Enzyme design. Structure first.
Site, PDB file in Angstrom:
ATOM      1  N   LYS C  10       0.805  -1.050   0.096  1.00 43.41           N
ATOM      2  CA  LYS C  10       0.010   0.079  -0.150  1.00 43.41           C
ATOM      3  C   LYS C  10       0.715   1.048   0.041  1.00 43.41           C
ATOM      4  O   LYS C  10       1.748   1.423   0.826  1.00 43.41           O
ATOM      5  CB  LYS C  10      -0.956  -0.068   1.050  1.00 43.41           C
ATOM      6  CG  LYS C  10      -2.107   1.074   0.995  1.00 43.41           C
ATOM      7  CD  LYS C  10      -3.134   0.678  -0.116  1.00 43.41           C
ATOM      8  CE  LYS C  10      -4.346  -0.050   0.748  1.00 43.41           C
ATOM      9  NZ  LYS C  10      -5.057  -0.892  -0.509  1.00 43.41           N
ATOM     10  N   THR C  57      -3.381  -5.614   0.267  1.00 43.45           N
ATOM     11  CA  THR C  57      -2.920  -4.285   0.753  1.00 43.45           C
ATOM     12  C   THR C  57      -3.819  -3.452   1.772  1.00 43.45           C
ATOM     13  O   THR C  57      -3.149  -2.545   2.566  1.00 43.45           O
ATOM     14  CB  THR C  57      -2.676  -3.469  -0.523  1.00 43.45           C
ATOM     15  OG1 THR C  57      -3.855  -3.003  -1.355  1.00 43.45           O
ATOM     16  CG2 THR C  57      -1.801  -4.240  -1.826  1.00 43.45           C
ATOM     17  N   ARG C 176      27.230  35.186  -9.254  1.00 47.36           N
ATOM     18  CA  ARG C 176      25.885  34.820  -9.741  1.00 47.36           C
ATOM     19  C   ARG C 176      24.958  34.615  -8.669  1.00 47.36           C
ATOM     20  O   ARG C 176      25.619  34.514  -7.580  1.00 47.36           O
ATOM     21  CB  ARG C 176      26.159  33.632 -10.604  1.00 47.36           C
ATOM     22  CG  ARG C 176      26.581  32.228 -10.191  1.00 47.36           C
ATOM     23  CD  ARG C 176      26.545  31.249 -11.166  1.00 47.36           C
ATOM     24  NE  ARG C 176      27.028  30.012 -10.183  1.00 47.36           N
ATOM     25  CZ  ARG C 176      26.985  28.740 -10.613  1.00 47.36           C
ATOM     26  NH1 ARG C 176      26.568  28.610 -11.888  1.00 47.36           N
ATOM     27  NH2 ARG C 176      27.023  27.867  -9.925  1.00 47.36           N
ATOM     28  N   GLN C 228      29.035  21.404  -7.628  1.00 48.33           N
ATOM     29  CA  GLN C 228      29.840  20.330  -7.141  1.00 48.33           C
ATOM     30  C   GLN C 228      30.584  20.258  -5.927  1.00 48.33           C
ATOM     31  O   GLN C 228      30.911  19.527  -5.209  1.00 48.33           O
ATOM     32  CB  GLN C 228      30.660  19.960  -8.329  1.00 48.33           C
ATOM     33  CG  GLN C 228      29.991  19.496  -9.552  1.00 48.33           C
ATOM     34  CD  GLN C 228      29.450  20.456 -10.736  1.00 48.33           C
ATOM     35  OE1 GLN C 228      29.235  21.471 -10.304  1.00 48.33           O
ATOM     36  NE2 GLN C 228      29.349  19.779 -12.052  1.00 48.33           N
ATOM     37  N   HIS C 256      18.257  28.140 -12.474  1.00 53.63           N
ATOM     38  CA  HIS C 256      18.965  29.315 -13.034  1.00 53.63           C
ATOM     39  C   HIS C 256      18.275  30.509 -12.928  1.00 53.63           C
ATOM     40  O   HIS C 256      16.922  30.577 -12.849  1.00 53.63           O
ATOM     41  CB  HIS C 256      19.045  28.984 -14.519  1.00 53.63           C
ATOM     42  CG  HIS C 256      20.021  27.701 -14.684  1.00 53.63           C
ATOM     43  ND1 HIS C 256      21.268  27.424 -14.103  1.00 53.63           N
ATOM     44  CD2 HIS C 256      19.734  26.535 -15.152  1.00 53.63           C
ATOM     45  CE1 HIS C 256      21.681  26.230 -14.533  1.00 53.63           C
ATOM     46  NE2 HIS C 256      20.763  25.534 -15.067  1.00 53.63           N
TER      47      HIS C 256
HETATM   48  O1  LIG Z   1      26.038  25.394 -17.119  1.00 57.55           O
HETATM   49  C1  LIG Z   1      26.260  25.167 -15.955  1.00 57.55           C
HETATM   50  N1  LIG Z   1      26.358  25.709 -14.839  1.00 57.55           N
HETATM   51  C2  LIG Z   1      26.658  25.281 -13.837  1.00 57.55           C
HETATM   52  N2  LIG Z   1      26.863  25.621 -12.579  1.00 57.55           N
HETATM   53  C3  LIG Z   1      27.686  24.723 -11.616  1.00 57.55           C
HETATM   54  O2  LIG Z   1      27.734  24.998 -10.625  1.00 57.55           O
HETATM   55  N3  LIG Z   1      28.091  23.418 -12.269  1.00 57.55           N
HETATM   56  C4  LIG Z   1      27.838  22.900 -13.219  1.00 57.55           C
HETATM   57  O3  LIG Z   1      28.251  22.035 -13.668  1.00 57.55           O
HETATM   58  C5  LIG Z   1      26.799  23.782 -14.331  1.00 57.55           C
HETATM   59  O4  LIG Z   1      25.567  23.291 -13.764  1.00 57.55           O
HETATM   60  O5  LIG Z   1      24.319  24.010 -14.008  1.00 57.55           O
HETATM   61  N4  LIG Z   1      26.621  23.870 -15.549  1.00 57.55           N
HETATM   62  O1  LIG Z   2      -6.429  -5.012  -0.467  1.00 61.52           O
HETATM   63  C1  LIG Z   2      -6.065  -5.343  -1.643  1.00 61.52           C
HETATM   64  N1  LIG Z   2      -6.596  -5.484  -3.025  1.00 61.52           N
HETATM   65  C2  LIG Z   2      -5.975  -6.089  -3.928  1.00 61.52           C
HETATM   66  N2  LIG Z   2      -6.408  -6.167  -4.991  1.00 61.52           N
HETATM   67  C3  LIG Z   2      -5.624  -6.773  -5.822  1.00 61.52           C
HETATM   68  O2  LIG Z   2      -5.753  -7.205  -7.069  1.00 61.52           O
HETATM   69  N3  LIG Z   2      -4.484  -7.341  -5.209  1.00 61.52           N
HETATM   70  C4  LIG Z   2      -3.850  -7.047  -4.102  1.00 61.52           C
HETATM   71  O3  LIG Z   2      -2.714  -7.455  -3.743  1.00 61.52           O
HETATM   72  C5  LIG Z   2      -4.803  -6.025  -3.475  1.00 61.52           C
HETATM   73  O4  LIG Z   2      -3.863  -4.900  -3.784  1.00 61.52           O
HETATM   74  O5  LIG Z   2      -4.555  -3.370  -3.660  1.00 61.52           O
HETATM   75  N4  LIG Z   2      -4.744  -5.694  -1.951  1.00 61.52           N
END
Ligand SMILES: O=C1N=C2NC(=O)NC(=O)[C@]2(OO)N1
Ligand SMILES: O=C1N=C2NC(=O)NC(=O)[C@]2(OO)N1
Ligand SMILES: O=C1N=C2NC(=O)NC(=O)[C@]2(OO)N1
Ligand SMILES: O=C1N=C2NC(=O)NC(=O)[C@]2(OO)N1
EC number: 1.7.3.3
Lengths: 295, 295, 295, 295
Positions: C10, C57, C176, C228, C256
Site C-alpha cells: 500500500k 494491501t 551569480r 559540485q 537558474h
Molecule cells: O552550465 C552550467 N552551470 C553550472 N554551474 C555549476 O555550478 N556546475 C555545473 O556543472 C553547471 O551546472 O548547472 N553547468
Molecule cells: O487490498 C487489496 N486489494 C487488492 N487487489 C488486488 O488485485 N491485489 C492486491 O494485492 C490488493 O492490492 O490493492 N490488496
C-alpha cells in the site's frame, strides 16, 4: 460589522456512476468531481455560533451521492440543476445553490476494432464542466464549458502589424507555431426551473459537441492573424448554431515555442525557413480573453 | 573522504521538432523532455574546485538541441543512443551518458473526417519514454516504457482467496471496479554500439505498439483474479512477441473505487448487485510491481 | 517465463498521530505519508492466480494504523523499522518489507511570543524522509533524508574555468545567483535488527539536525566554485560528525536565474555589476549529484 | 455578434529583484510572479484582424521587467499600482490594466544565530498577493491577500448543533481536529491615483502583518464553534484595526481528519477520548466563505 456575502458547502466530491444494460451487457461509466456551495439565511452561523442554520457539509456530500443514485448524472447541466433545486426546495432558509461539476473522460475502448462492453480509457485530461446557479425566485443560470483541450499547429499562424514602440522587441512573423489550452464557456438563457431545463436536455450534449467541433476545425483551418482573431471566429460560429446561448467566452494561453539560433555552431541554420528545432517555453505565456454576444 | 558516485548534467530540457514535407505539405511534430547526465573522470570538480573537467550543463543543453537538428528524434531509443554516444566519443574523460527522454503526444487532428496536414491534439497525457545508458566499453543499455495510460473496467475484476487474519477487514469480492495508471517497461538486450541500435530501428516503434496493444486487450478481456495475475499475463505476452527484449516490468496502482452504503437513507440499495454510485479514493492505493523474464 | 522480481503493498497512506500530555496540556502532532511494499514467496499470486500468499494491501494499510497506535511514530527511522520487522516476523513467507515514510512539518505556533499548546503551522514543504528495508537474514538498511529545502543566495557563487569548446556559449562568471532544492540522504550502517536500531535512537534526530545545519551553513558561507564543490563540502562535514553513517548523497538542481539585458531600452543597465532584475528559469535546470563515502 | 468583454496580456511572468547595500554588504531579494491584462479600444483585434491596437504581450513582459528595474517592487500594492498606471498613461486607447502579483517567500537565513547578509530560505509556500485594477477615470482598486497559510490545531475545535435530517450522518463533536489553508483578502478603499496609493504606503505591509497575526492568534486561541464562527472573528478584528479597508474575505477549506475505529483489532481503543491515530482526508473537503464589511 456584518456579513456582506457568505456561501459554504462541500468541494472536491469525487463521484463515479455506472449504468449496466443487463440485456446487452454493455456498461457505461461516468466520473465527476462536484462542488456544492449554499447561500441563504445563514449569517448567524458566522456571527452568533448558530449552527442550527447549517446543513452540514458532510450532509451536502451525502446528498450528492443520493442524488446521483436517484437521477441521471448526464448531461451534467441536468444533474447540476436537479442537485441545486433540491437544496432550495428542501431547506426553506437556503436561497441559492451553486453547483460546479467537472466531468472526467472515460472513453470506451476499442479492442480488435470492436467497442468493449466494460473497459474504458482516460483518452484526454480535457474536461467538460458546468456551473449551475439555482437562485430562489431567479431560476437556473447555467454556464457550460470545455477545458484542458490542448492543441498545436505547426504553421498557418501569423503575428504582424502590432503596435511598435520603445518597449517592443518582438519580431513580426508570417509563419509561427500556435499552441493553446482551450477553455471555452457558453452561457445559456436563464431557465425558469427544472421543467424548462429538462425541456432542452438534448441541446446540452449537442451544444458541447458543436463547441468542440467548431473549436477544432477553426483552429486547424484558420490561417490565424492572432489568437484574438481566431478565437472570435470560434465564438461567432457557436452563437450562430445555438440560439439558446447568450454568450461564448474563450480564455486562451499563447504557449510560446521559441526559435533557437544555432548559427554560432558550425553555421547551423535553424531560424526562419530553416527552423526545425524549437524551445517550448513553460512561462511566461500570453493570455487572451473575450466574451462574444449578439449585436 | 572520497567520491563514490557522481553524475551531473541538464534536466527538464523541452524540445520540439517539426518535419515539413514540401511536396505534400504534410508537417509532423515531435515534442520531448530530455535529461542528460554524465559520468567520468570528474571527481576533482567536487573535491578540488576543478572545473576543467566539467562540460557545462548549459553546453549539454546546447548539444541536445544541435543533436536534434542534425538527426532524427524518432524513435526515441535511437535519438537517445545518438545523443549518449556523442558525449562519450567527444570527451575522452566522460565514460557514461545517461539519457532520459519523455515523449509527449501530438496526435494529428482529423477535421471533417480527413487528417489535417499541420494541426495536432494532445489526445492523452500518456507518455512514451526511454532510458538510454551509454557506457564506454559496455555498449548501450535501453529501457523503453509507456506510462500514464489510465484505464478503468467496471466489472470482470475479482479479488478473493487472499490471506485472512486478525489484521484483515477487506471483504472478498467477485465483481469490482479495477482502475490503474499503467507504467510498463521493456528492457532490451545490450547493444554493442550505435550501429547495432540502428540495425534494429523498426523494432522500437513495433514493440511499443505491441506493448500498448497487449496491455489494453489483456486489461479489457482478462476476468481478473488480481492485479498480480493480470499484469503477469501482459508481461508474458510481450516477451513472446519480441525476442530482443529480456524483461518486462509493470508497476500498477490499484486506484480504489469504494461502494457507498446508502441504506441509512430511505433504505436505498447501492451495494452489491445494486451498486451504481461509488466513491473514487484518491489515496491510499495499492501498488503492485513485477519484473518478468524468460525461464 | 518467470517472475524475476516482485513487490507489492500500500502506497500513499496518510497518517496523523497526536500525543496529549494531560498534566501540562501540551499536545504534539505528527503527520506522515507511508508506503509499505512486501517481497517473499508470492510469485504464485502472479503466475497461478494464487491469492493465498497475498497479505491484502488493505490489510497492510490497517497494519500501518495499528502499528502507529501501539508504538511511537518518531523518529521515523524507528517507526519504519518496527513496521517492517512486523511483516517479516508475522508472515513466514514474507522475506522483505520496504518502508518509505515522508514526514510533513507541523511546527508549533508561537502566539504573543509563547509556544501554543495545540496549534501548528506547516512552516515549510520541506520533508524529512526514511527508506527502511527490512530483509530477513540481512538486518535493517536505513536511508534517511531531507528534501524540498529550497534556498537562494544572491552572491558568493561563481562558475568559471569550465571546459570550452564548439558546444559552449556560457559566459564565465565571478558573481551569480545560486538557488536549489536540497535532497540530502545519509545511509546508515546496516543494523542487525530492531534492538540495534533502538540502541541508536537519539542519533536519528541528532543526525538529521546536523545534516540540515551543515547544509544551510555551508550553502550560506561557501564562496562557491560550483555546485559540485559546495555539495562535496557538505557531505564530508556530515560524515565527520556521525561515524554510524557510511555515505552521504546530494542531488541538487541548479535553478537558474538569468540576467536580463535591458540596454535596448533607453540604455538601461541591468547586467554585470548593474544587474538587479533577473528572470527565474523554470526549466531546464542543471542537476548535480554525488555520493561521498570514507576513503 | 459583438465583443461584450475582452482583456489580454502576459501571465506567469517570473521576476526576481535584488537590492544590494554596498556600505553594509546586506542584500535583500524579492521574487514574484506577475500577470498584466489590459482592456480598452481593442475590439477590432478580435473582429477585423486589426493588430495595430495590440500592445504585444511580449512588450507587456518587457515592460514588467523595465518597471521593476526603475521602481521599488515592494510593497506589491505599490508596484502593481505603478505598473498598471503605466499602461493607461502610455497608451491612449488602453483604459484598464489588471495587475496580479504573487509574492514568493525568501526569508533571510540565520546562521549561528546571526542573520546572513545574502542567503535565504523558502520558509513557507505561503504567498502574499495583490490584485490591482487601474481603471481610467475610476482610480485604483486594490485587493491584498495572504494565501497558502496551512495550519492545524489538535483540540479546541467543536461542531455540534447543526441541522439534522434524513440526509445527516455526521456525529456531533465537542473535540475535533481543525486544519485549513488560509486565503484571506482585504479590499482597500478606492484610491484616486498613484499619489494617493503612495501616501498610504506604510499601511500595506502593516495591514498584511495585522491580517497574518490576527489569523494565527484567533485560530490558535478560539475554542471554535465552527469554521464560520472563527473566521468571522478574524475578519471583524482586521476591520477594527485598519479603517482604510472596506471588507475582509476568508475562504477556508475544512481539511478533514477522520477518526479510525480499531476496536475490531484486539479491542484497540482509538476513538473519542482515546483517539490518537487519524486518517487525513485528501478529499472531499468543506469549503467555507464569507465577506465581512462594516455595518
Ligand atoms: O552550465 C552550467 N552551470 C553550472 N554551474 C555549476 O555550478 N556546475 C555545473 O556543472 C553547471 O551546472 O548547472 N553547468
Ligand atoms: O487490498 C487489496 N486489494 C487488492 N487487489 C488486488 O488485485 N491485489 C492486491 O494485492 C490488493 O492490492 O490493492 N490488496
Ligand atoms: O507578443 C504577443 N504575441 C501574441 N500573439 C498573439 O496572437 N496575440 C497577442 O496579443 C500576443 O499574445 O501572446 N502578444
Ligand atoms: O460537515 C461539516 N463539518 C463542518 N464543520 C464546520 O466547522 N462547519 C461546517 O459547516 C461543516 O464544514 O465542513 N460541515
Amino acid at each position: 460589522s456584518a456579513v456582506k456575502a457568505a456561501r459554504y458547502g462541500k468541494d472536491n466530491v469525487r463521484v463515479y456512476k455506472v449504468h449496466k444494460d443487463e440485456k446487452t451487457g454493455v456498461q457505461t461509466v461516468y466520473e465527476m468531481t462536484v462542488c456544492v456551495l449554499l447561500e441563504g439565511e445563514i449569517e448567524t452561523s458566522y456571527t452568533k455560533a448558530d449552527n442550527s442554520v447549517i446543513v452540514a457539509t458532510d450532509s451536502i456530500k451525502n446528498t450528492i451521492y443520493i442524488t446521483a443514485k436517484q437521477n441521471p448524472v448526464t448531461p451534467p447541466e441536468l444533474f447540476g440543476s436537479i442537485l441545486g433545486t433540491h437544496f432550495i426546495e428542501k431547506y426553506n432558509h437556503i436561497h441559492a445553490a451553486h453547483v460546479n461539476i467537472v466531468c472526467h473522460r472515460w472513453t470506451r475502448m476499442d479492442i480488435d476494432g470492436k467497442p468493449h462492453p466494460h473497459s474504458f480509457i482516460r483518452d484526454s485530461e480535457e474536461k467538460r464542466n458546468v456551473q449551475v446557479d439555482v437562485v430562489e425566485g431567479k431560476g437556473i443560470d447555467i454556464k457550460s464549458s470545455l477545458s484542458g483541450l490542448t492543441v498545436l499547429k505547426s504553421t498557418n499562424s501569423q503575428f504582424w502589424g502590432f503596435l511598435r514602440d520603445e518597449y517592443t522587441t518582438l519580431k513580426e512573423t508570417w509563419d509561427r507555431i500556435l499552441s493553446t489550452d482551450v477553455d471555452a464557456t457558453w452561457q445559456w438563457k436563464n431557465f425558469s426551473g427544472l421543467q424548462e431545463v429538462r425541456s432542452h436536455v438534448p441541446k446540452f450534449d449537442a451544444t458541447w459537441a458543436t463547441a468542440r467541433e467548431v473549436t477544432l476545425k477553426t483552429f486547424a483551418e484558420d490561417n490565424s492573424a492572432s489568437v484574438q482573431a481566431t478565437m472570435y471566429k470560434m465564438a461567432e460560429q457557436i452563437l450562430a448554431r445555438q440560439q439558446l446561448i447568450e454568450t461564448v467566452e474563450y480564455s486562451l494561453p499563447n504557449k510560446h515555442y521559441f526559435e533557437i539560433d544555432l548559427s554560432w555552431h558550425k553555421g547551423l541554420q535553424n531560424t526562419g525557413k530553416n527552423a526545425e528545432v524549437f524551445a517550448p517555453q513553460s512561462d511566461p505565456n500570453g493570455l487572451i480573453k473575450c466574451t462574444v454576444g449578439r449585436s
